[PDB]
């Protein structure tokens, strides 16, 4: 089974790390590739063999017109936001969900909270407070998920890989089907 999955969301939520941490089981953080690319993984899910094509995106505003060229024939989207970036969570509803739905009205969405590992980091919570902000909590992401009617809400870390595999199994599970 060939499944095409597109990953959207604000620059720097960790889309490229998520894809590479997934396909290769190692985290770039140190050396992140800047050429926007597509990747591949052969996965077994509920006894069915799957070839999953993962398509990265340029979330920059400069790419508003060209980004949707990679949307045709997509089987499932991950809309991603950083659990340590409220601005990114805001943009799911202000920008990403509306753009996905504009081009692909019926394609399933998985809502993904990323950098799960920084949610307890001290220096991180601290910096967030200096802006009168705080990490997105599980209940908050679940609510956004319900707002936008995504098939699942899932948290992960590319750095630790916690929950990373489930993100992709549910992606696959959402195509073929509820």
Ligand X SMILES: Nc1nc2c(ncn2[C@@H]2O[C@H](COP(=O)(O)OP(=O)(O)O)[C@@H](O)[C@H]2O)c(=O)[nH]1
In the complex, which residues of this chain contact ligand X (CB under 6 A)?
Answer: 11-17, 29, 32, 114-115, 117-118, 157-159
Pairwise CA distance, residues 44 & 149, whole Å: 27
**Are 81 and 143 contacting, i.e. CB atoms less than 8 angstroms apart?**
no
**Are 79 and 100 contacting, i.e. CB atoms less than 8 angstroms apart?**
yes
Q: Which stretch binds Mg ion (CB under 5 A): 12-20, 64-72, 85-93, 104-112?
A: 12-20
Pairwise CA distance, residues 176 & 79, whole Å: 19
Q: Which stretch binds Mg ion (CB under 5 A): 10-18, 46-54, 65-73, 130-138?
A: 10-18
Our CB check for ligand X shows the closer of 17 and 145 to be 17
Pairwise CA distance, residues 172 & 4, whole Å: 9
Our CB check for ligand X shows the closer of 75 and 117 to be 117
* Contact flag: residue 88 with Mg ion (CB under 5 A): no
Which residue among 16, 82, 114, 157 contacts Mg ion (CB under 5 A)?
16
Q: Nearest distance from residue 126's CB to ligand X, in Å?
A: 15
Residue 102 class from Cβ within 10 Å (0-12 exposed, 13-18 middle, 19+ buried)?
A: exposed
For binding to Mg ion (CB under 5 A), which residues are involved?
A: 15-16
């Amino acid at each position: 089974q060939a499944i095409k999955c597109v990953v959207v969301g604000d620059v720097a939520v960790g889309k490229t790390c998520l894809l590479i941490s997934y396909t290769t089981n190692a985290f770039p953080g140190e050396y992140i590739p800047t050429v926007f690319d597509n990747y591949s993984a052969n996965v077994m899910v509920d006894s069915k063999p799957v070839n999953l094509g993962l398509w990265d995106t340029a979330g920059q505003e400069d790419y508003d017109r060209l980004r949707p060229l990679s949307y045709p024939q997509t089987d499932v989207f991950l809309i991603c936001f950083s659990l340590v970036s409220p601005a990114s969570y805001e943009n799911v509803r202000a920008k990403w969900f509306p753009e996905v739905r504009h081009h692909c009205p019926s394609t399933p969405i998985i809502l993904v909270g990323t950098k799960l590992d920084l949610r307890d980091d001290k220096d991180t919570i601290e910096k967030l407070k200096e802006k009168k902000l705080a990490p997105i909590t599980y209940p908050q992401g679940l609510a956004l998920a319900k707002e936008i009617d995504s098939v699942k809400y899932l948290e992960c870390s590319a750095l630790t890989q916690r929950g990373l595999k489930t993100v992709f199994d549910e992606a696959i599970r959402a195509v073929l089907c509820p």
